[PDB]
Scaffold this active site. Sequence first.
Site, mmCIF file in Angstrom:
data_model
loop_
_atom_site.group_PDB
_atom_site.id
_atom_site.type_symbol
_atom_site.label_atom_id
_atom_site.label_comp_id
_atom_site.label_asym_id
_atom_site.label_seq_id
_atom_site.Cartn_x
_atom_site.Cartn_y
_atom_site.Cartn_z
ATOM 1 N N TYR A 162 0.684 -1.272 0.061
ATOM 2 C CA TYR A 162 0.042 -0.095 0.070
ATOM 3 C C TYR A 162 0.763 1.301 -0.158
ATOM 4 C CZ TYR A 162 -3.785 3.077 1.665
ATOM 5 O OH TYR A 162 -4.891 4.076 2.033
ATOM 6 N N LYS A 166 1.010 4.131 -2.767
ATOM 7 C CA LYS A 166 0.694 5.470 -2.414
ATOM 8 C C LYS A 166 1.584 6.843 -2.657
ATOM 9 C CE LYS A 166 -3.837 5.466 -1.315
ATOM 10 N NZ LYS A 166 -4.853 5.949 -2.230
HETATM 11 N N1 LIG Z 1 -9.827 7.203 5.043
HETATM 12 C C1 LIG Z 1 -8.402 7.408 5.589
HETATM 13 O O1 LIG Z 1 -8.178 7.575 6.858
HETATM 14 C C2 LIG Z 1 -7.451 7.228 4.375
HETATM 15 C C3 LIG Z 1 -6.005 7.613 4.943
HETATM 16 C C4 LIG Z 1 -5.050 7.681 3.794
HETATM 17 C C5 LIG Z 1 -5.397 7.131 2.538
HETATM 18 N N2 LIG Z 1 -6.716 6.799 2.124
HETATM 19 C C6 LIG Z 1 -7.025 6.665 0.900
HETATM 20 O O2 LIG Z 1 -8.210 7.601 0.334
HETATM 21 C C7 LIG Z 1 -8.976 6.975 -0.330
HETATM 22 C C8 LIG Z 1 -10.593 6.977 0.044
HETATM 23 O O3 LIG Z 1 -10.890 5.965 0.989
HETATM 24 P P1 LIG Z 1 -11.694 5.713 2.135
HETATM 25 O O4 LIG Z 1 -11.372 5.982 3.457
HETATM 26 O O5 LIG Z 1 -12.954 6.600 1.809
HETATM 27 O O6 LIG Z 1 -12.353 4.376 2.019
HETATM 28 P P2 LIG Z 1 -13.700 3.614 1.715
HETATM 29 O O7 LIG Z 1 -13.573 2.203 1.543
HETATM 30 O O8 LIG Z 1 -14.682 4.323 2.409
HETATM 31 O O9 LIG Z 1 -14.256 4.040 0.055
HETATM 32 C C9 LIG Z 1 -13.378 3.790 -1.046
HETATM 33 C C10 LIG Z 1 -14.294 3.668 -2.032
HETATM 34 O O10 LIG Z 1 -13.404 3.302 -3.303
HETATM 35 C C11 LIG Z 1 -14.097 2.065 -4.074
HETATM 36 N N3 LIG Z 1 -13.248 1.238 -4.961
HETATM 37 C C12 LIG Z 1 -12.426 0.204 -4.459
HETATM 38 N N4 LIG Z 1 -11.988 -0.279 -5.489
HETATM 39 C C13 LIG Z 1 -12.600 0.352 -6.986
HETATM 40 C C14 LIG Z 1 -12.171 0.272 -8.010
HETATM 41 N N5 LIG Z 1 -11.397 -1.014 -8.508
HETATM 42 N N6 LIG Z 1 -12.906 0.606 -8.958
HETATM 43 C C15 LIG Z 1 -13.702 1.998 -8.305
HETATM 44 N N7 LIG Z 1 -14.004 1.899 -7.069
HETATM 45 C C16 LIG Z 1 -13.184 1.282 -6.135
HETATM 46 C C17 LIG Z 1 -14.942 1.364 -2.729
HETATM 47 O O11 LIG Z 1 -15.860 0.736 -3.471
HETATM 48 C C18 LIG Z 1 -15.167 2.610 -1.895
HETATM 49 O O12 LIG Z 1 -16.371 3.246 -2.515
HETATM 50 C C19 LIG Z 1 -8.354 5.614 -0.612
HETATM 51 O O13 LIG Z 1 -7.578 5.553 -1.850
HETATM 52 C C20 LIG Z 1 -7.789 5.297 0.566
HETATM 53 O O14 LIG Z 1 -6.637 4.481 0.338
HETATM 54 C C21 LIG Z 1 -7.650 7.119 3.079
#
Ligand SMILES: NC(=O)c1ccc[n+]([C@@H]2O[C@H](COP(=O)([O-])OP(=O)(O)OC[C@H]3O[C@@H](n4cnc5c(N)ncnc54)[C@H](O)[C@@H]3O)[C@@H](O)[C@H]2O)c1
Lengths: 302, 302
Positions: A162, A166
């Site tokens: 990851y 990232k």
């Molecule tokens: N939430 C955090 O604290 C955090 C921290 C660092 C990075 N991120 C990143 O931020 C982004 C948002 O994550 P989140 O926390 O909202 O997670 P989340 O699971 O709530 O939402 C992620 C969305 O992406 C969708 N998804 C996954 N694979 C997919 C694909 N192949 N095609 C289309 N959609 C797909 C999921 O169905 C979901 O709707 C992600 O990239 C995550 O890695 C989040």
Amino acid sequence: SPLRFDGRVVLVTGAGAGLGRAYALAFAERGALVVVNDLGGDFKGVGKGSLAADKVVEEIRRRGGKAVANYDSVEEGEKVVKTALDAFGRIDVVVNNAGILRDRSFARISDEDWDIIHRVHLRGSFQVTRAAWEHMKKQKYGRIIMTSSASGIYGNFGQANYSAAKLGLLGLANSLAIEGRKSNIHCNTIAPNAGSRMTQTVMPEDLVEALKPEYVAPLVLWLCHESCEENGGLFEVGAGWIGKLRWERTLGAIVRQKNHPMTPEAVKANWKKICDFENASKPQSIQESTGSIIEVLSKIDS
Amino acid sequence: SPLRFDGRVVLVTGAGAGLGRAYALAFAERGALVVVNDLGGDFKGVGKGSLAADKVVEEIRRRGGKAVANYDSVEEGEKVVKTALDAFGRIDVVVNNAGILRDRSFARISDEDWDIIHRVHLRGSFQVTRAAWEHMKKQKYGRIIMTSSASGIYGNFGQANYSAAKLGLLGLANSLAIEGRKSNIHCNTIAPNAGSRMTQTVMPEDLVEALKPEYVAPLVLWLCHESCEENGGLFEVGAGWIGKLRWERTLGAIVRQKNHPMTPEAVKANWKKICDFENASKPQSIQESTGSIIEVLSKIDS
Ligand SMILES: NC(=O)c1ccc[n+]([C@@H]2O[C@H](COP(=O)([O-])OP(=O)(O)OC[C@H]3O[C@@H](n4cnc5c(N)ncnc54)[C@H](O)[C@@H]3O)[C@@H](O)[C@H]2O)c1
Ligand SMILES: NC(=O)c1ccc[n+]([C@@H]2O[C@H](COP(=O)([O-])OP(=O)(O)OC[C@H]3O[C@@H](n4cnc5c(N)ncnc54)[C@H](O)[C@@H]3O)[C@@H](O)[C@H]2O)c1
């Protein structure tokens, strides 16, 4: 004057939940024509469904906004951007947000664990962005967001796959900012903090609720606005706070002397100076670092 | 006292030419049992041959060192590490150096351009390093190098694919440093500058000759030595100079107020403050960034 998006086609990938959902709503409320992309599977990369994107499109329309759904994986980035072109006839804003998790200690990361993380996060963002790129150049307008993470920036136990994906995204963004500039295409990167199904495993329930994704959305909207000039920036964001990151670079040491072999013993002897950040420089571009290194050759021969 | 590698099994990937060759020769001259890996193809990822690795093995043996050849692609990282296990019975140092170029404007990067760069640079270093990992942990000794680039750190026109892969490597290094630490396994990353077949296209002939890969080898040997304590660092290196890079992070702005929705207008109004690097902090880990962001929640409530 309020920051509006009337007449701007905005794609948000992974817009069925969490941060993407918050983005999609916040854009549509400011008049954006929104493409709500979601594969509709779980946070580990298993499954697919129409429900996840369809629920958000419905919410947007109920709130009096305009939206259409896309159900393809970001792996099929061309198909994702096609929905914007079919529904609205253009694509102006791309928010690369789709993501999944495969946490495992390093020796335990399978080939599948690596490939799926990289196909979705990094290759997926590439696919989507490449599909939009020539449309943005011909229009001479684009705004793109990559979603990195603190784990990429700092490293994190159990997340080598990851964190590689990232920080790869940031690497991508560094070059897009350069190639897009003269065409009024901006690319910026965020490292968000929000309670979601992805973060439920690591955060207590009360924190999940408190760290709202709507605390990140205002940054995304600003970085994606026509009036924004920020390009190639990296931002950490959560809880209502925003900060910016940049590289600083030690003055370093010229260890090699004219007519003498450079040795690892001289490196070791000069280690404190090499690593001393007092009066560190703030390098702005490849030319700047590369140019100063090359000028070291003539300095030694002088 | 001279820095020796007597009895240390050192693998260098892509050791047939350029920087990898210089590392292999420098290691072997200090008593290292060297595995000289090279696919033996061109710098755009086409072709295969035994000649590249064999030449370097014979040069080492002619100089009185110990070496064996491996001819697999780093894509087959288990097979590369198996040569060290078969020839010498252990693996102690891994220098991930193998790489190729596929320069192209963003819209013009094909799927094959992307996949080959990412398979070789990023997935390749992963496969090689993963194969060594459990051997390093059981021994309680490891030294690993990832090779990034200035184009990954700063971005570069026409290299979006490569810059993604190169900064992805740093992301991988950030996490390995953390996972390896308690086991006396160190991972560091370099961003080198050297004349080679890869850089001949962008540098004048006299510069290619002057910017010797032998000016980079002394850093790699130091970072791979048993007495080296450096772990998780990022270094720029060339011409006889070395420097170190770190993130700095603005104090930023808390733009959300209690009981008021956070708006993109407030982000915009506080942009100067958010972007102001005066008294910027120097964040050392994910805990530090994450923790201080979470603390902002209670600060707003207070
Ligand atoms: N939430 C955090 O604290 C955090 C921290 C660092 C990075 N991120 C990143 O931020 C982004 C948002 O994550 P989140 O926390 O909202 O997670 P989340 O699971 O709530 O939402 C992620 C969305 O992406 C969708 N998804 C996954 N694979 C997919 C694909 N192949 N095609 C289309 N959609 C797909 C999921 O169905 C979901 O709707 C992600 O990239 C995550 O890695 C989040
Ligand atoms: N020279 C520079 O200024 C510079 C700058 C930044 C990064 N780098 C990086 O440094 C590393 C070496 O660069 P160089 O200048 O010595 O290049 P080079 O072409 O001279 O040597 C690269 C070697 O890697 C080998 N290789 C390619 N694919 C392989 C594979 N799949 N398996 C095993 N070996 C493979 C090639 O056969 C070649 O011998 C590369 O990762 C490069 O991207 C170099």
